[PDB]
């Protein structure tokens, strides 16, 4: 059974059925395509089915370098001893590097515009081209790697390609860790959940299991509620870069041609900085660009991301809402009245009970994004617990965590504490005006912006071997 072209329910397909009076799909014989996640132990009549993580769980920039040795080598420039990552040999963005193209059998990116013939990009992770804004971030980090390897090559002439590569990769990895834990997570969790789940780092604990939990793969999709219906692009004075400043998201998915032929990554990065994210409200959960028209250009029918999330949690055998609440030490509402109190919203509680019958069966993503957001955070108690618990394990259970004694020198850690996403943008783009830290909060130009000239670059002097 071809899960993409058939609605027949047979391994490995688990198509989403269409309800009566669906707002878009009036034909109930249709379905939303769904392939079951690969089983860790195929065909077993003994093991309880589990799914696989194809990536390293560590915050180690594996989306830049790859999580398997063949790929990681192919992403590298082996033509010399500079320790660089390979760049696009057919295109540049205003004289700067693009990611190399990938070689896929059925390249989805080609389908987003037939005459442009721009394939998907090749990166450490397979999804770099899924949206141009994500592609911009991969490209930004690729450039920072090479910029770091170049400076390092000046400070340390004896260092060969392997040494430069590893040293540049080690700095980039720390950068992703610092941006994530210092600037991002506090704004996800809120101050209260941050202090509770991520207490001050002490040191590496080899008894802390660093694996991604199955539930996290669905819980962290809370980010789907932050998605705006457009890709916003702005010029160097931060105005709508015509003729298409606000492209519907359903025409940017896998649209790699837009990065290559529509102005590169600068217009996109400025759009991310100067545009508010969407706020998650209990009756404004996720936009139809992803609920109705997900990947519309690259397959027979538009998908529904929120619906895929719920079908995925069932595919993965994930427990319902109350089981996760109990796991987190949170009260488990049994009636519509109790659910209403937990949600501070009787109307939503009624809709949930009407769908599920009991809060015991609410799918984890649905229940998690339904909760009122913690003060100065963008998730409720349940997701804060799941996400905070995951990130503490990824930190404490990482032998190469940037703050672990032995990884960096005291002076190296002092230099790295000055890094920021805004500075990295200043170092690797044609943008000379960027967001004031914290970049995840700033969103209004020019009130929240500053010149790059005012931001101290990373000082690699303490990397000198002398």
């Amino acid at each position: 059974v071809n899960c993409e072209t058939s609605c027949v329910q047979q391994p490995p397909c688990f198509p989403l059925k269409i309800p009566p009076n669906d707002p878009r799909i009036k034909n109930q014989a249709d379905c939303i395509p769904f392939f079951r996640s690969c089983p860790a132990c195929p065909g077993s009549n003994i093991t309880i089915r589990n799914q696989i993580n194809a990536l390293t769980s560590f915050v180690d920039a594996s989306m830049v370098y790859g999580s398997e040795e063949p790929l990681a080598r192919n992403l590298r420039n082996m033509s010399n001893q500079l320790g660089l990552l390979a760049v696009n040999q057919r295109f540049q963005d205003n004289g700067r590097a693009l990611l190399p193209f990938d070689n896929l059998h059925d390249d989805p990116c080609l389908l987003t515009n037939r005459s442009a013939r721009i394939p998907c990009f090749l990166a450490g992770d397979t999804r770099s081209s899924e949206m141009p804004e994500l592609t911009s971030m991969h490209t930004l980090l690729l450039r920072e790697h090479n910029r770091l390897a170049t400076e390092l090559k000046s400070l340390n002439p004896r260092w060969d390609g392997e040494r430069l590569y590893q040293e540049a990769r080690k700095i980039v990895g720390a950068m992703v860790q610092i941006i994530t834990y210092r600037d991002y997570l506090p704004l996800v969790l809120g101050p209260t959940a941050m202090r509770k789940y991520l207490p001050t780092y002490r040191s590496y604990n080899d008894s802390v299991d660093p694996r991604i939990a199955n539930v996290f793969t669905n819980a962290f999709r809370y980010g789907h509620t932050l998605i705006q219906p457009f890709m916003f692009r702005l010029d160097n004075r931060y105005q709508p870069m015509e003729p298409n400043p606000r492209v519907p998201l359903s025409r940017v998915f896998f649209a790699s041609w837009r990065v290559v032929l529509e102005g590169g990554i600068d217009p996109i990065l400025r759009g991310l900085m100067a545009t508010p994210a969407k706020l998650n409200r209990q009756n404004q959960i996720a936009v139809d660009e992803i609920r109705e028209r997900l990947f519309e250009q690259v397959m027979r029918i538009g998908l529904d991301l929120p619906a895929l999330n719920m079908q995925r949690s069932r595919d993965h055998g994930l427990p319902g809402y109350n089981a996760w609440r109990r796991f987190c030490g949170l009260p488990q509402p049994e009636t519509v009245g109790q659910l209403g109190t937990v949600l501070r919203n009787l109307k939503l509680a009624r809709k949930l009970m009407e769908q599920y019958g009991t809060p015991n069966n609410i799918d984890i993503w649905m229940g998690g994004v339904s909760e009122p957001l913690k003060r100065k955070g963008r998730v409720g108690p349940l997701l804060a617990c799941i996400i905070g618990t995951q990130f503490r394990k990824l930190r404490d259970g990482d032998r190469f965590w940037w703050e672990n004694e032995g990884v960096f020198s005291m002076q190296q850690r002092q230099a790295l504490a000055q890094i920021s996403l805004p500075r990295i943008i200043c170092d690797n783009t044609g943008i000379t005006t960027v967001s004031k830290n914290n970049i995840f909060m700033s969103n209004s130009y020019p009130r929240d912006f500053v010149n790059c000239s005012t931001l101290p670059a990373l000082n690699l002097a303490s990397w000198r071997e002398a």
């Binding site: 059925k17 269409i18 669906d22 996640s37 309880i48 589990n50 696989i52 993580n53 194809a54 990536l55 769980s57 180690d60 989306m63 370098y65 790859g66 398997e68 992770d125 770099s128 949206m131 804004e133 971030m137 590893q166 080690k170 990895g173 941006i179 994530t180 996800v188 080899d206 660093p210 793969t217 980010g223 932050l226 991310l272 994210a277 404004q284 959960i285 609920r291 895929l308 079908q311 069932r314 993965h316 055998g317 994930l318 427990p319 319902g320 939503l348 949930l352 769908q355 009991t358 069966n361 649905m366 963008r378 618990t389 990824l394 259970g397 967001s435 970049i439 995840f440 909060m441 969103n443």
Partner: protein, 104 residues
């Protein structure tokens, strides 16, 4: 695992020396709670017509989406205190953490 090293392996192997595959690529996720399948070990809830979950009919995922998630786009509330970069770093970071393979 080498008695000593200088950098992360690409697969993540050997970060944890006592249990070398922990956090490494192409390994099963850890389970914080036992799985809940229709038959106890493999079939997803919603697979077999008429089979309830814990006393109640399984809601079609698309039905829950239509009833609870769907909203008029003109009602969208721009987050006054977060940039769209907040969303985008989230996706980028997720792709450093997990990718769940499926058959082609």
């Amino acid at each position: 695992c080498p008695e000593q090293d200088k950098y992360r392996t690409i697969t993540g192997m050997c970060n944890n020396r006592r249990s070398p595959t922990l956090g490494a690529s192409n390994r099963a996720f850890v389970r914080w709670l036992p799985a809940e399948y229709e038959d106890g070990f493999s079939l997803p809830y919603g697979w077999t017509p008429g089979v309830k979950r814990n006393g109640f009919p399984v809601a079609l995922a698309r039905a829950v989406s239509n009833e609870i998630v769907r909203f008029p786009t003109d009602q969208l509330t721009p987050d006054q205190e977060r940039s769209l970069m907040f969303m985008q770093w989230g996706q980028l970071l997720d792709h450093d953490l997990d990718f769940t393979p499926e058959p082609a």
